[model samples]
Target: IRCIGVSNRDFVEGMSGGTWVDVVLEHGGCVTVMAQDKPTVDIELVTTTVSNMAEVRSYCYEASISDMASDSRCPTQGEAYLDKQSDTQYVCKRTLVDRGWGNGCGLFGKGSLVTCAKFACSKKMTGKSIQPENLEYRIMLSVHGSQHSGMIVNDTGHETDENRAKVEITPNSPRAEATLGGFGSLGLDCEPRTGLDFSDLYYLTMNNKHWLVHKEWFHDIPLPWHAGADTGTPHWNNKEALVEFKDAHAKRQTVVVLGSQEGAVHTALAGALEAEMDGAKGRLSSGHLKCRLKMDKLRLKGVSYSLCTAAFTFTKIPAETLHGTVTVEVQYAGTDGPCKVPAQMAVDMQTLTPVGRLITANPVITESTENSKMMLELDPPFGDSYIVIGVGEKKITHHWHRSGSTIGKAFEATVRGAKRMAVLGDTAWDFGSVGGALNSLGKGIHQIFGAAFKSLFGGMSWFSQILIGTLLMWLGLNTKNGSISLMCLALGGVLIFLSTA
Candidate 1:
């Protein structure tokens, strides 16, 4: 049996160069030949049947193939159209249920509580130098009072060396990784600091609005209020880092709690503080103390008086002492009072850790708009993104990182209480606590690393940071082999360090 090969050259090897010839095959591989002597051909047809017709029918009878049938439905309209339509192509509609929220509600808690308080003074400040100009106020609420221990936020080391070099860098997760050794690492979670004092004076600036002076803060602080203290225990300028005892005499002049009588003002500051301490149960002043702020025969819409509130805790403070100081930190977005300011709020207590420390204040206004750039939802209002704007919309919306997050909501609620707060608007307490730098840095990095690692994974559109995050976050989170993905995620963080460096 010889097989001739086809070629570009037109030729008949056995036939004459220019003559015509017919070819025939008497096949044997599968067909039987009847004759081959004079180029004749034979053909045969055969049929075979198995005993599975009944079984086959039974197997597929329940299986549907109708257009809307369960299993026998025609190759999806897409597949059918793909074949029937032109060679070009058609776009298939895809529905992503729960879109990017793979294991919704599996990551963390549902709601975050942000507490806010404000500061105000009777008269306008005389010396503008000491008064804060552009205040960078932040209030830190320690869920666990003074006894709680752990480093705060990012380390001077956690931040890039470049940024760290500009200021002091403290340990972030690295601190935990170094000291406690990763996730299982446990001990004392650092309690948030209470408030600011004279020593923590804020440098001032003026641009029609008051702002905090930008200063390079050292993140090299420690937990237990004593990281920066030379002594074993936490202390600020020879003072106990936090309150020593409830009744201990505060070295400062007065508690400031009884200094205010204005109901709204008291409600804003002291009232808000006391409410948070009692889990929003109790109000600060049972009654307002009325005092006259004599005006030149001008009738005011509301009376301004002095009032006070206490942040109750098992803190280390002396009972009946007037020397100790209790500070409240407040962070806010827009103020509805005489002045509009952005701040983070906090308050001090005698106990090592207080409920006040746990609250995270946010800007009062939260505005969200579709992310035009992201493909999460593609269409307008459907986009899977939100924006949290503070101090008016002009400021960069921290939407990407702050949406539905605890810090996001807390900040808004706290600022809403500004009018009722009594703390001077320009006081140094405005910059909540530079001390909280360490704590915030830790949480910030935990999220940063988590988000960055997820972005690298999921084989998403690496071109867009958001898409990459959406895919990995949705698919990778719930997969049984999630750890297999996390290993690389952690590894990516290491690479991020190198690349950023």
Candidate 2:
């Protein structure tokens, strides 16, 4: 009428002592035990159909003896071979699929992308166990990116703070519950920052030459790109951040655009700033300018020079007096001159394409024999749209594309020449305003936090020190608070001081 579950093989072997004489059943489907001519134990044969004999063996006494019945289940090899071994054994063996993956061994090596997995398995006797090659097993398995195995003990929070071996059991499952123990340790190296792909399921394989071996399955996974890792250089998620504009003088230096892209110099700026504003002496000359596009903002790969391009927008200078004729001149660096010029590349303000080019000079304007400077003049009845110059030779393919993106379009009513907004001093500009603010905020927050921590933590106790250090470290790890994390380390030293004091 009542039963107890036990796993010790020795205990099961010794059940036939004293009055517990083994009963010889008279019937085939049922068994019974009688005490002093009184019916005490009556067991019925299980008629429930099972697909595999292993499933039949997995049930408790009542189910295995009477409730479960086999239809056509044959003993699996894994079941048959493992039955002869000890009840609960730990071994490393290949996963079933692993045999077909590598050579006959199905082994893998370090950094092989697709390689072997290693584990410590506590296996038990079961047909399905042999199939998992290590089923009904307790194991601490390794992954690609971590430093320790995934198997772990459970914290019960009892009188003993020590963790206990975790176990899972299912009566209908093929895997048998085997007691596993230990402080399992399996560390993996490939992680998000470590530049390794997340690990997949691994299997244990045993060969006489190699026992308890770990190997991974067939997969084409590669190390993933972790955007948050320290790349030793700057990188950006938004490509628009790379475009920048700055101001020197509002009058003559009315417009400028700068950009950098992949496979190109880190900084390339080609635009004109009108200088020598005096009416009699004012003559447009090629202005040499350079930019330092924060490598973080380009969002492009690598740090080398190639033919790169960028788009810029311009607006009309708001001051009426500053509306004196505006001219554009491009002067590409280097002595290789005689640069050919494109005849007519229309400036499109609406769509903002085909705006300008890097150009060399015409002899008279350049006032020299070399042709490293070219001039672009904006003349009469000019709307807000400004004309862009084009480089005609192969020597100058890298240039900024300028546009007037609806900036000064409204001023077209008053200013006869004003078409679109200028991208210079005092006009509608997108490149510098927002980016400058964001960059400044990030830098400012860090500096202020570091300064504040030094002043605040000097008088705190060891307990307070831990609390502050914990909070700062948590902020640093959980948020974009690098300054907090750095300062917390300094705060950590204070903890040691407070403790010693």
Candidate 3:
């Protein structure tokens, strides 16, 4: 298999004038070589200042590639560099220094050249070649140097759905590489070479796979890189290695955005290292890398905020098993105002299932001081794909699940909620006022009728008073008891005379 890559000149220029060059030789096609058939590997280091440019040191090794395929060992080869000071001669011995992997796998070599010591000294790679078919590994190359104290260089072997090699040279670190996995001879001209204060940024894949990367500080630093003040790791390191996931059955684009001070952070858009499968086996959906803002909901509410999402995975040793946790850090202007109502969300990377309450926070602003911070918890576990969080309503509807990444419709719950609250409140107040007026009128009419009834029969037997009033009303004469009025008497005599009685 022929490996494809850019020429060395282009590759070196891309390094941005690195001080040290790290050359890596990697096995391609995952081929296996027999123990007895493994051939000798040779590496030569050339420096301008050592041995007056005439001294060359080459280290050679003969080993069974299969023995060290999965194991890491120190370099076994050795060379000597001589220094002449006045009449004294000093010697510096170089040894085989393989830090991570061995032959039939990956090999690392690095050196640096000194410039401007009055007389200049530089290192160069004279030659690097392995016997044909003795080992089936190609080469991956990188050059790194630190102008400032904090710098980082990293390589992630065949990982991700694409199964491609990945190299990360953070902005702070300034590094670049060329990785080859097929049949090809890689020649390097090494004059010389040699050999994070930021919080490490990590992300959980939609598949629940976890990967982390940080800037490698060039200076002497302490353990737990994130222990110091601003000297510690970025909550979301600017160089994040997160990937986007799309459902195989849906179009919804699920993305994970890490919260960082420089806005939100995301994984570098290159390739991902495959999860270290101690015993667990899983996969992620095919998608690209995306950087989204975590303060969407808060912004809708007009709140100033910062947030970060970090993830990690744990395993049950002995068998292939795993579990994970996602930590969310949230900070806001912590004020007693409407914008303080915040929310959060966690989802499975693959299934896109909501793992916890979609929105978690104050539903209404409460009286409080400035700069409130909170950490959120997830139950039912986070999905393996990705998560989205904000500070308002859970706008991710069934329609979103149904539409998937293809859902182009955008909706903002904060805006809509505010509108609905205003309209509904106004209408409710109007209806309440009308109902109060009708109630008062009904009470006034009741009072008037009640007073009239009390005045008419307050001291009498209720039944008797009602009967007398009814009888008097029928006779067309006024009488509380059974008696005629004076007017009634006069009228009766007139009627008798008229009848001649």
Clashing pairs counted in every model = 109, 48, 50
**TM-score versus the correct structure, for each prediction:** 0.13, 0.14, 0.13
The most accurate candidate by TM-score is: 2
Report lDDT (Cα) of residue 402, candidate 2: 27
How many pairs of residues collide in model 3?
A: 50
| Model 1 alpha-carbon drift over 4 Å, by segment | 1-432, 436-463, 484-501
Model 2: per-residue lDDT, tens digit, 1-501?
A: 111111100001111222232211111122222222111222221111111111101100010011111111122213122321232111111112112223223332211111111111121111111122112211111111101111112234211222122222112332222111122211111111111111221111111111111122111111111132343432222212222222232111111112112112111111212222222212222211111111111111111222212211222211111222233344433333233333223444334354332111111111124323333322212334344433323322222232232444336333321211111111211112123565456445644654575477654455766776566556555556657666557645444444443
Which 10 consecutive residues of model 1 have the lowest summed lDDT? 52-61
- Poorest 10 consecutive residues by lDDT, candidate 2: 56-65
Candidate ranking under TM-score, highest first, comes to 2, 1, 3
How large an RMSD does model 3 have? Answer: 43.7
How big is the positional error of residue 432 in model 3, measured in Å on the Cα after superposition? 49
Q: What is the C-alpha lDDT of each candidate?
A: 0.20, 0.23, 0.23
| Cα error, candidate 1, residue 433 (Å) | 1.8
In candidate 2, stretches whose alpha carbon ends up further than 4 angstroms from where it belongs are 1-338, 342-438, 442-501
